[PDB]
Each structure stands twice: as C-alpha cells, then as structure tokens.
Design an enzyme around this catalytic site. Structure first.
Site, PDB file in Angstrom:
ATOM      1  N   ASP A   1       0.811  -1.206   0.000  1.00  0.00           N
ATOM      2  CA  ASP A   1       0.000   0.000   0.000  1.00  0.00           C
ATOM      3  C   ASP A   1       0.858   1.276   0.000  1.00  0.00           C
ATOM      4  OD1 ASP A   1      -2.393   1.578   0.127  1.00  0.00           O
ATOM      5  OD2 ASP A   1      -3.290   0.128   1.504  1.00  0.00           O
TER       6      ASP A   1
ATOM      7  N   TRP B   1      -3.573   3.416  -5.674  1.00  0.00           N
ATOM      8  CA  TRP B   1      -4.862   4.126  -5.813  1.00  0.00           C
ATOM      9  C   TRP B   1      -4.968   4.979  -7.076  1.00  0.00           C
ATOM     10  CZ3 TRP B   1      -2.911   7.215  -1.102  1.00  0.00           C
ATOM     11  CH2 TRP B   1      -2.587   6.350  -0.039  1.00  0.00           C
ATOM     12  N   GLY B   2      -4.109   4.690  -8.051  1.00  0.00           N
ATOM     13  CA  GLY B   2      -4.058   5.470  -9.294  1.00  0.00           C
ATOM     14  C   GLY B   2      -3.305   6.784  -9.182  1.00  0.00           C
TER      15      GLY B   2
ATOM     16  N   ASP C   1     -10.548   3.462  -3.124  1.00  0.00           N
ATOM     17  CA  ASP C   1     -11.226   2.220  -2.711  1.00  0.00           C
ATOM     18  C   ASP C   1     -12.663   2.113  -3.211  1.00  0.00           C
ATOM     19  OD1 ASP C   1      -8.833   2.119  -1.336  1.00  0.00           O
ATOM     20  OD2 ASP C   1      -9.759   2.031   0.672  1.00  0.00           O
TER      21      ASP C   1
HETATM   22  O1  GAL Z   1      -6.153  -0.219   5.649  1.00  0.00           O
HETATM   23  C1  GAL Z   1      -6.266  -1.122   4.549  1.00  0.00           C
HETATM   24  C2  GAL Z   1      -6.851  -0.515   3.272  1.00  0.00           C
HETATM   25  O2  GAL Z   1      -5.968   0.508   2.843  1.00  0.00           O
HETATM   26  C3  GAL Z   1      -6.302   1.181   1.637  1.00  0.00           C
HETATM   27  O3  GAL Z   1      -5.294   2.126   1.338  1.00  0.00           O
HETATM   28  C4  GAL Z   1      -6.370   0.167   0.502  1.00  0.00           C
HETATM   29  O4  GAL Z   1      -6.603   0.840  -0.716  1.00  0.00           O
HETATM   30  C5  GAL Z   1      -7.456  -0.858   0.849  1.00  0.00           C
HETATM   31  O5  GAL Z   1      -7.608  -1.801  -0.191  1.00  0.00           O
HETATM   32  C6  GAL Z   1      -7.083  -1.559   2.163  1.00  0.00           C
HETATM   33  O6  GAL Z   1      -5.922  -2.320   1.923  1.00  0.00           O
END
Ligand code: GAL
Length: 614
Positions: free
Chosen positions: A142, A182-183, A203
């Site tokens: 992430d 996230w693009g 998301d």
């Molecule tokens: O906290 C976990 C989440 O964090 C976001 O940044 C991610 O895009 C989600 O898919 C999930 O992994």
C-alpha cells in the site's frame, strides 16, 4: 487461417481478501473460518486460489534486529501458522504492508488504534524475505506512507519489485506483487513489468458504507487503460463487493461482468461464512470466469455508445474471431443496446452469440446483436466464430523496429508479436509506440516453434507508426488489426503541427489540455460523438471549465455530463467552437511548443485557432 500459435499469458489473481468485510478486525480465527467456507463453497475448483490477509495483522512492532513481530494472541504460532493452514488446503496465502515507514493502520485507523511503524520502508529486502520465509505467495503493498512522505511512486515500487524478486529467488517460492497506490501518479504508465497488478483508483468501498453501484462504475471507468495491460500485467479496479449486503443478484452479476470484461483480478471480499447459494454460483460461473481469465491477457474497451448511458464493451479473446461483450445500461429505464461486428473489429460475416448467464446460444448474425437491458443492468455475451478484420503484417526494418505501420483511423489496435523463447523462463522487452510512454511486454516460453503474444496499442491515422522493442527475444514479425469501436482522431493545430494532449495519460477531472508532439497515444485520441462531445479514454469529455464564456477560459477534461460546455462544433473554416460560449479552441498566445495551454478565445483568422480533426 491460424498459422502461428497464440502463447498463453498469466491471468489476473483470483481469490478472497479480508478488507471489504472485516476491515482491520482480523486474526487467525477470522482467516481460518473464511478459508473453510471458501473450500466448502467450491471456490478452489472454479479457480479461486489466493487467501489474502489485508490490513490489521501487524501493529508496527519489530524486534531489535528489525524483524517484524506479531501478537501471537491474535496469530498463534506466528504468521507461518496461517500460511501453513492456507497451503494445507492447496491454496496460496497473501500478506499486506506499506511502501512507507508507517501504514494505513497508522494514517487511517479503521477498527483498531493507530499502528506506528506499520510499513516496510528501510526494510524492503528484510520484509519481503520475511514474508516469503513465512510462506506467503502474494503481497499487497500500500501507499499510505508513500503518500504521506511525498515518495515518487514509480521509483519506489521499482525498488519494492526488485526486493520481491530477490525474496522469491532466495526461498524458491514465487511472490505475486500487488501494487496498491490508488491510481496516484498514473501507475498505468509504469507498473507493467514491476508487478502483475496495480490499483487504478481509490477504494471501491469505505469502512461503514454500503456497497454502491456508482462507486463500482467509477472504479471500472478508472481502470480502463488498455495499452498498459497485457502479457500478465493487469489494471486493478479493486476487490469485489459481490455478495456484500445490499447488492442484489443482478448487481452481483453486473459486478462480475465488468471485472471480467476488463480481465480484472477476482478477489472476493464478502463474508464467505454467510454467502448464499446464488452468490456462490455467481462467483463460480465458469463462462464468465473464462472471459476474465482469457489466455490472451487483453483488456476490454468501450466500442459503442450511440445513446448516452447505453454502452457496449468488447474484449478480444484468445483464438481468432472471438469476442466477449458487455451491454451496460447506466440509465433509469430499460432500453435495447446493440453491438455491431464492425465496432468489434470483425467483418460482416456470420458469428454466434451466447449469453453467459443464461449459458445458452441466443442467435447468429452477420452484422450485430441487440438485447433488452434493464435500468442499471447488464448483459454478458460472447460473439464467436466470427471473421477478423483484415490485418497488416510487418517485418522488422531494423533490429527490434517495425516501421510504416498503418492505421485507417487513429485508435486502438491489437498487435500480435511473433517470437521464439525456447527456454524455461519468460523474458521481457520494453515496447515503445511512436513517441508514446513506453511499456513492458513479457514473452513466455514457446518451445522450439514460434508463438505470439498480444498487446493493445494506440496508433495514429496513416503509415507513420513505429513499434520499437528493446531487450527480450528476437521477434519474427507483427500482425496489426484495428478495433474500430475505439476510433478517434488527433486534433492537430494548424500553426504548431502539435496535437491536443492530456499530459502523461492523466485522467483527473480538471486537467487542462495542451499542445504536444503528436504520438497517437490514448491521451491524444479524441472521439467526436453525435452529441458533439470530444471524448478521451472513452469516458472523459473536452470541457470549457465551469461553463466559462470569456477569453482565457481553461479547456480541460471532465467526466461527460451532457452540458453545453462539453459540446463542440467542428467548422468548415478549421475552427472548433464551444457550443455554450461560441468561443474558439485556442493555443494560448499562439505559442506552438509542447505544453502550450488550450483555452477558449474569441474566434479570429489566426492559425492557433485552426485544427485538423480526421
Ligand atoms: O487499511 C487497509 C486498506 O488501505 C487502503 O489504502 C487500501 O486501498 C485498501 O484496499 C485496504 O488495503
């Protein structure tokens, strides 16, 4: 005839991941129960393989040597105990970390207190090795710490990718990297070659919200980058909401349809322990799965929208004369939707249509197919046994270089690259089309005989296109076929000889158009509609910002919204006028260089207001 075989390329991951239904509230028992239900529901036989543990397993703790430590009250036996359980069922195990020093569990706590230190920065090799040693087969990396810290995504994920490769090489266990940024900073430009999948947007669903078809469609629209996806590298529109509370069976099917037409990962996100029989059947539809996992690896594209909100998406499948189609109705009423063979890049010859939810052949046609589609609904088809449009065939004019490549129109083409790779490992090459952003292509083993892999590329009208490869196996010819449904036009300034361009393939609402050296990329291919829109990427409209009606009004891209500020007259004098304002599309201050802003300005006779649009 079929004379060189198509080589199968890796498919997108299929499996289940813990985030959508559990947020950070996960432990060994939660994962174990989901694994058991996954198995009980027969998901493995349908092709679902990964059990991915998302955020919440790690609170940022490390020992004095920098090794990740976990709370064994939540993870008895440590992380190798949950991978052993997952593997005991013949499945693959996934884990989750951040590119930065602290993770999303720190920056955006969601079910647990903040977890400082929950990222792998300064420990890429250490952590990747640790994950692989524990038995993980997949890692989602992430961007919460990357975003917070101001890191450059392309170089950071390259470093991560290298560490992933070394870890898998050390242990002997393959490690599938999921890039999750996230693009941000346009991962479609650089992620292919670094990882088999990259997130293309924010998301699909947020903690505490209900599943939304609007959100689903937004993620789908943002994932469509067909030049970036090929040969086992995939755009990732995010984890499935299939089977989550509030979604009907029809919305579940539509969710599958759109992910399948993209060739997206199918990572289930529902609570498998309470999954209905109908939901399980929707996840397991083998005909829809086969489309998603098609051996040719290509991304589906919009091929028609004759009426606003009534859309046909087509995907070029393995073999010849085979397509999958989604007919999608974004309107509030049931309407007929037609797909034409011409738009699919087939000739007007007989082909068989099959409905993949009815699991029945539904007719034949030499021209097209029309179905009634419910408001907000979709129909999933294949069109098979068709005849392909005439292709061009080319021999390289110098090492790794194909020149004089011809297109009847500016737009998307399928290229089949012939090669031999008589080794046990895939090889990669860099591919560059004209002066566009380059991409990476993977070439799987072929045996002693030649095979092809396929890529989608955007070309300029005419015979001046070049495809240049660097590295990888010697290629033995290319075949080029157009997808006419994707046809557009370069909008070329008379004074400058440069093209209306959206910088670096950016899709963000409000990005201002500029002049740039013409290269025929997706960010330069404008489709003029019957509604007088100039459409980019199939889903962004050339837009006079905030309906501005005076000199200097910025011309940008924006989601198409039917407003007069997105309507344009293409005039016989070479001008292009905004309907709302009556002002001319104008290269600002009659500058001609790369990066010259496009604005609206009072129409005159100047050549910085004159354009060619064919
Ligand atoms: O906290 C976990 C989440 O964090 C976001 O940044 C991610 O895009 C989600 O898919 C999930 O992994």
């Amino acid at each position: 005839a079929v004379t060189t075989r198509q080589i199968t390329v890796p498919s997108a991951p299929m499996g289940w991941a813990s985030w959508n239904s559990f947020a950070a509230k996960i432990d060994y028992s939660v994962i174990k129960k989901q694994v058991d239900a996954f198995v009980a529901a027969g998901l493995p036989a349908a092709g679902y393989t990964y059990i991915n543990i998302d955020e919440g397993w790690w609170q940022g703790t490390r020992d004095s040597a920098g090794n990740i430590t976990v709370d064994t009250a939540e993870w008895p036996g440590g992380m190798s105990a949950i991978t052993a359980y997952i593997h005991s069922k013949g499945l693959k195990a996934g884990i989750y970390t951040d590119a930065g020093k602290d993770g999303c569990g720190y920056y955006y706590p969601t079910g647990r207190p903040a977890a400082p230190g929950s990222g792998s920065e300064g420990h890429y090799d250490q952590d990747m090795l640790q994950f692989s040693t524990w038995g993980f087969d997949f890692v989602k990396v992430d961007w919460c710490g990357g975003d917070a810290e101001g890191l450059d995504a392309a170089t950071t994920y390259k470093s991560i990718s290298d560490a992933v490769g070394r870890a898998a090489a050390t242990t002997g266990r393959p490690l599938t990297l999921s890039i999750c940024n996230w693009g941000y900073q346009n991962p479609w430009n650089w992620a292919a070659g670094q990882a088999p999948l990259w997130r293309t947007s924010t998301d699909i669903i947020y903690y505490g919200n209900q599943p939304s078809m609007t959100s689903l469609l937004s993620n789908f629209d943002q994932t469509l980058h067909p030049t970036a996806q090929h040969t086992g590298y995939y755009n990732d529109p995010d984890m499935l909401m299939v089977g989550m509370d509030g979604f009907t069976a029809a919305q579940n099917r539509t969710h599958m349809n759109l992910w399948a037409i993209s060739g997206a990962p199918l990572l289930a996100g529902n609570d498998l322990t309470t999954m209905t029989s109908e939901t399980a059947g929707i996840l397991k539809n083998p005909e829809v799965i086969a489309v998603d996992q098609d051996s040719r690896g290509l991304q589906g594209v919009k091929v028609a929208e004759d009426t606003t909100g009534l859309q046909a998406y087509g995907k070029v499948l393995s073999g010849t004369g085979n397509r999958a189609v989604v007919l999608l109705n974004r309107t509030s009423a049931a309407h007929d939707i037609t797909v034409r063979w011409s738009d699919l890049g087939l000739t007007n010859a007989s082909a068989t249509v099959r409905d993949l939810w009815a699991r029945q052949n539904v007719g034949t046609s030499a021209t097209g197919y029309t179905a009634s589609v419910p408001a907000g609904g979709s129909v999933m088809l294949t069109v098979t046994g068709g005849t392909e449009a005439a292709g061009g065939a080319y021999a390289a004019t110098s090492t790794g270089r194909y020149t004089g490549v011809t297109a009847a129109s500016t737009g998307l083409n399928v290229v089949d690259v012939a090669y031999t790779n008589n080794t046990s490992s895939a090889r990669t090459a860099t591919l560059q089309v004209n002066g566009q952003t380059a991409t990476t292509v993977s070439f799987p083993p072929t045996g002693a005989s030649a095979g092809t892999v396929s890529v989608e590329v955007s070309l300029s009208k005419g015979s001046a296109n070049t495809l240049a490869l660097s590295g990888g196996p010697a290629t033995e010819g290319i075949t080029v076929r157009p997808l006419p449904g994707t046809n557009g036009a370069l909008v070329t300034g008379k004074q400058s000889g440069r093209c209306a361009d959206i910088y670096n393939n950016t899709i963000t609402n409000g990005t201002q158009a500029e002049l740039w050296d013409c290269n025929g990329g997706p960010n330069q291919s404008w489709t003029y509609t019957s509604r007088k829109e100039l459409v980019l990427y199939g889903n962004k409209c050339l837009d006079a910002y905030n309906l501005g009606t005076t000199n200097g009004t910025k011309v940008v891209i924006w989601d198409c919204n039917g407003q007069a500020n997105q309507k344009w007259n293409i005039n016989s004098d070479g001008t292009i006028t905004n309907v709302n304002a009556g002002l001319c599309l104008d290269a600002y201050n009659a500058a001609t260089a790369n990066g010259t802003s496009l604005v609206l300005w009072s129409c005159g006779t100047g050549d910085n207001q004159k354009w060619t649009v064919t």
